[PDB]
């Protein structure tokens, strides 16, 4: 088949869905029992069975899909915060690069789903690897999703104006990236510099 601009936007949107589920699971944002094991990208992953969250993510993912297609979304951020104070403790950032020319493409692009799938699987393994060094979240936390766009006027009303919600004193490590040939997704996670080691 190959890669079209719409095919790519679906891949990426869907990646974010699985990416978010894995963060919320691995970081204990929702209890581990509100998650279920499924097969995706050739491995076993955890996705929510919480009905509100399912609905919420379906809505986000459908919107990202639309924005990615139009090259209207540059950053997707998962902000993890102390439920009491609102202090940001951990902040996962995805940067999205777009080939705006892919709209002019007369053929799907040559990259095997397998190839893309190997890339995504590598990125997800990496996300899993973070449990082994991320500072413990030692208070109860919630999450929030932010996006960054250049096209502000066409953002649906349901999306509220926001700050970037940076951590004051942070450490950040770069994760692997993947590419469809049309969208490239860079990842990283930042977190508050620990009190002591």
């Amino acid at each position: 088949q190959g890669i079209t601009a719409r095919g790519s936007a679906e891949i990426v949107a869907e990646f974010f869905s699985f990416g978010i589920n894995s963060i919320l699971y691995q970081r204990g944002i929702y209890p581990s029992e509100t998650f279920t094991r499924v097969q995706k990208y050739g491995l076993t992953l955890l996705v929510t069975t919480d009905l509100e969250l399912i609905k919420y993510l379906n809505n986000v993912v459908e919107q990202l899909k639309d924005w990615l297609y139009k090259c209207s979304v540059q950053k997707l951020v998962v902000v993890i915060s102390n439920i009491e104070s609102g202090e940001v403790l951990e902040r996962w950032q995805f940067d999205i690069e777009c080939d705006k020319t892919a709209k002019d493409d007369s053929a799907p692009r040559e990259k095997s789903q397998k190839a893309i799938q190997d890339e995504i699987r590598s990125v997800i393994r990496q996300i899993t690897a973070t449990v082994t060094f991320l500072p413990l979240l030692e208070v109860s936390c919630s999450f929030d999703l932010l996006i960054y766009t250049d096209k502000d006027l066409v953002v649906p009303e349901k999306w509220e104006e926001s700050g970037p919600q940076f951590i004051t004193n942070s450490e950040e490590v770069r994760l692997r990236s993947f590419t469809t040939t049309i969208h490239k997704v860079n990842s990283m996670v930042a977190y508050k510099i620990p009190v002591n080691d």
């Binding site: 509100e52 919107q63 919630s142 960054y148 766009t149 349901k158 999306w159 509220e160 104006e161």
Partner: peptide, 11 residues
């Protein structure tokens, strides 16, 4: 700019 879409509130 930055925009936010808040997750369901929890009880």
């Amino acid at each position: 700019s930055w925009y936010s879409y808040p997750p369901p509130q929890r009880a």
